[PDB]
Amino acid sequence: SGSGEPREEAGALGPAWDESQLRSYSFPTRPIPRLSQSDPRAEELIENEEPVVLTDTNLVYPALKWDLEYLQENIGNGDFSVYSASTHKFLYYDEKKMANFQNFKPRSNREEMKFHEFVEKLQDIQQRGGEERLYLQQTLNDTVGRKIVMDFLGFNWNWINKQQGKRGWGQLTSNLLLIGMEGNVTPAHYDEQQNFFAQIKGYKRCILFPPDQFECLYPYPVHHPCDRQSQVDFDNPDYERFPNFQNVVGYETVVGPGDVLYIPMYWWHHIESLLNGGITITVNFWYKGAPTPKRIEYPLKAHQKVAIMRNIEKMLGEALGNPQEVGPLLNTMIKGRYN
């Protein structure tokens, strides 16, 4: 199923989106349940760290009116982080980690600019028929226009705050504002925080994979710049290197204006902006997860095992004095002994 049968906009405006807009992949997916926030099922899902789309939080209600003209006019003047890509797949690398891998070259460069500048480039490419794609990802801080700040004050903080309280998560780390061109893709990867993905303008197709599918997704070495990202190219999966990618099953859904997707921590997610569907705008909120209990309980959850693996890689890297030696030692350790 996945996104399944497209929702119909009220007033007979027709199907919000349709199939030809989604990209094609090798794996099967099932739908993430779209529920009402009042629905006890949703709170259960969140409590159990399973994804769910909430259709009625009103979380970013004030922002549903945002668009580029509005944002330009009222977002004020400040530098916005903007990324560029040669193709539809945006490549993110952690700059602090580049020292560890010399044979790494940036394929998706960051550029700091002013909203009007980013808007100019966007409009320009549209007219100039450029190959290029752009993505604006900027954390929001109190430097924004008065109107935007008022809009922010209008968010349903009461609801997001209650969620944080009930589940015992840590304080709200931050929120990021995301504006991207249609067809843009943020390749599968996972975060270690609990995320609330609130859609504002346009539709984004969100594909999630649970933590227990770690074997099928082949993340980069922890010391690699692309740590937490899948090495597998969903457009041309290499089965010889990533054999278990053939056993992967995603959870799929398409979020639109007013929807909030709870992405549990450690859950893989692949996100794409619908083809020919125009510009997209999202505001993502995230919380550090609740801290681990004193005496752990078995069976362990899959994400704890993932945490365990991450930790061994980090320590091994620190102990040897080089991250490059991690793989060789681990192989020496496994070969003919555990495999």
Ligand X SMILES: CN(C)NC(=O)CCC(=O)O
> Binding-site residues for Fe cation, please?
189, 191, 269
Stretch that binds a second copy, among 164-172, 259-267, 282-290, 322-330 (CB under 8 A): 322-330
Q: For residues 221 and 101, give the distance between their C-alpha atoms in angstroms, rounded to a whole number.
A: 11
8 binds a second copy (CB under 8 A): no
DSSP E strand stretches across 128-214:
133-139, 172-180, 185-189, 194-201, 204-209
324 binds a second copy (CB under 8 A): no
Task: Find the binding residues for ligand X in span 187-216 (CB under 6 A).
Answer: 191, 195, 197
Point out residues after which the chain has a gap (C–N over 2.5 Å): none
Q: Binding a second copy by CB under 8 A: which of 99, 150, 249, 320? A: 320
Binding-site residue positions for substrate: 142, 171-173, 191-193, 228-229, 290, 311
Task: Find the binding residues for a second copy in span 81-100 (CB under 8 A).
Answer: none
Q: Give whichever of 144 and 265 is closer to ligand X, judged by the CB atom.
A: 265
290 binds a second copy (CB under 8 A): no
User: DSSP states of 11-34 as a string?
Assistant: TTTEES--GGGSPP-SS-EEEPPE
User: In the bound complex, which residue of the shown chain has the CB atom lying closest to Zn ion?
Assistant: 191
DSSP annotation of 167 reads H
User: Judged by CB under 8 A, how many residues of this single chain contact a second copy?
Assistant: 36
Q: Give whichever of 221 and 256 is closer to a second copy, judged by the CB atom.
A: 221
Q: For residues 134 and 46, give the distance between their C-alpha atoms in angstroms, rounded to a whole number.
A: 32
Q: Which residue has the tokens 């009222």?
A: 74
Q: Which residues have a Cβ under 8 Å from the Cβ of 234 and sit 6 or more positions away?
A: 25, 26, 187, 188, 270
The first and second tokens of residue 285, run together, are 């909120």
Q: Give whichever of 144 and 281 is closer to ligand X, judged by the CB atom.
A: 281
Is residue 7 within 8 A of residue 16, CB to CB? The reply is: yes
Q: Is 53 exposed, middle or buried (0-12, 13-18, 19+ CB in 10 A)?
A: buried
Q: Binding a second copy by CB under 8 A: which of 1, 243, 290, 301? A: 243
- The number of residues in the chain equals 339
- Contacts to Zn ion by CB under 5 A: 191
The phi, psi pair for 10, rounded to 5°, reads -60, 160
Q: Which listed option, ligand X, Zn ion, a second copy, none, makes contact with residue 290 (CB within 5 to 8 Å by class)?
A: none
User: Judged by CB under 6 A, how many residues of this single chain contact ligand X?
Assistant: 10
Task: Find the binding residues for a second copy in span 198-237 (CB under 8 A).
Answer: 214-215, 218-221, 231
Q: Give whichever of 205 and 224 is closer to a second copy, judged by the CB atom.
A: 224
Binding site for a second copy (CB under 8 A): 214-215, 218-221, 231, 241-244, 298, 300, 305, 308-309, 312-313, 315-316, 319-321, 326-327, 329-339
Binding site for ligand X (CB under 6 A): 178, 186, 191, 195, 197, 263, 269, 271, 282, 284
